[PDB]
């Protein structure tokens, strides 16, 4: 049924991981469109952490929309969203998606 | 010793641990993020290389004589802990390969 789409927040298992890679079941912000995510069963998504630390790659989620925390834009990963049990949670606003893409784009050298 | 992956480097890397259809194994990786970030965080963004191409547009072919053969999977870019996954310097990709991977990955990410 549900295919994650760009700008969706989803519950996802970030375990398995290695080292300082984000782990845990937590919200993920999806960057790749559902057309890709549906044909491959993979997606690009960033993990969400509970507390702002003023880390340069943090993008705060508006608390009023009921998922609190910061997207770690630099922690974007190709993820098997079936294997990691993606579950629909919310939709982030356009401006959060654009700021995450801007910060990750800069990191990737685009 | 003191090697820090830099943008455009090809490194051998453990893509395991992974889940499901995610790329696994010990394979070459094309580094996209700069050493100034990679060194402070111990993370990097990099794409895996596979020696067996399927012939889809998000595959970027490596030129010969770099020490490994195959295609960069631009859509499989990930944040990786490069010390945990035992990054080892291998080669440097040409600027045109790095630009093509970034263009294609930017398409996937909605840049």
């Amino acid at each position: 049924d549900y295919v994650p789409d760009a700008g969706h927040l989803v519950w996802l298992n970030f375990t398995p991981q290695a080292g300082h890679e984000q782990g845990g079941r937590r919200p993920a912000l999806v960057l790749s469109p559902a057309a890709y995510n549906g044909v491959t069963g993979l997606m690009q998504a960033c993990p969400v952490t509970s507390r702002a630390k003023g880390y340069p790659f943090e993008v705060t989620l508006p608390a009023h929309l009921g998922v609190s925390g910061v997207v770690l834009a630099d922690h974007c990963r190709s993820l098997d969203w079936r294997s990691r049990r993606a579950e629909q949670l919310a939709e982030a606003p356009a401006d959060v998606l654009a700021e995450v893409r801007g910060k990750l784009g800069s990191l990737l050298g685009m």
Side-chain angles (χ1 to χ4, degrees), chain A:
Chain A
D1 184 358
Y2 177 60
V3 177
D5 207 357
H8 290 188
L9 291 154
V10 301
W11 293 107
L12 197 75
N13 299 343
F14 285 83
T15 303
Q17 62 66 87
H20 296 301
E21 291 164 20
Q22 269 304 140
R25 189 153 182 86
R26 61 185 60 257
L29 177 66
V30 180
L31 294 193
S32 50
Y36 173 91
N37 303 342
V39 79
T40 63
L42 302 174
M43 64 181 185
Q44 286 276 356
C46 298
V48 173
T49 55
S50 38
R51 265 210 45 257
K53 288 173 174 193
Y55 182 74
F57 296 96
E58 279 170 7
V59 173
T60 58
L61 294 169
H64 75 265
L65 305 181
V67 192
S68 47
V70 286
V71 185
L72 297 182
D74 57 324
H75 284 242
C76 198
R77 294 163 42 185
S78 173
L79 293 150
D80 179 332
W81 55 266
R82 293 184 298 174
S83 175
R84 294 173 181 270
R85 309 199 255 78
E87 280 185 10
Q88 40 197 321
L89 169 57
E91 188 170 311
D95 63 350
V96 163
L97 189 56
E99 190 175 333
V100 170
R101 289 169 161 160
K103 285 186 176 193
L104 174 60
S106 179
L107 179 62
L108 293 172
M110 287 164 187

